[PDB]
């Protein structure tokens, strides 16, 4: 492991990837139900029980509620979390309304 901080492969588009897509398929919320959280957890470590996963994302989830800081924080340290989601979802438009970058800012003033 390197000191990568919050940088690995994290591109404009990723971070944008990561954030858009966890928050709007669990809730739409600013966090995310146990499902999306199930996906991500078990992509680096499966097989994990769920006394084991929610000890996992304990502290910041609690139980369930995996919310943005939490969230990013595990997958900007994870290069297959990142890409995980971009995988899933590519990077949003950022060019009708973005909020700030969509990546990696603190307040997202969305058009909402």
Known sequence: ????????????????????AFLSYAQGQDKVTEAMIDQLICGAFPG???????????????????????????????????????QHFPCAPEEEKPPEIDALELKTQKGF
Request: aromatic share 10%; hydrophobic share 35%.
């Open 1 to 20: 492991g390197s000191a990568m901080g919050h940088m690995v492969k994290i591109s404009h588009e990723d971070t944008q990837r990561i954030k858009t």
């Open 48 to 86: 994990l029980s769920w006394e084991q996963l929610q000890e996992k994302k304990k502290g910041r989830a609690a139980a369930n509620g995996y919310d943005r800081s939490a969230f990013f924080s595990l997958v900007a340290s994870d290069e297959q979390y990142v890409r995980f989601i971009a």
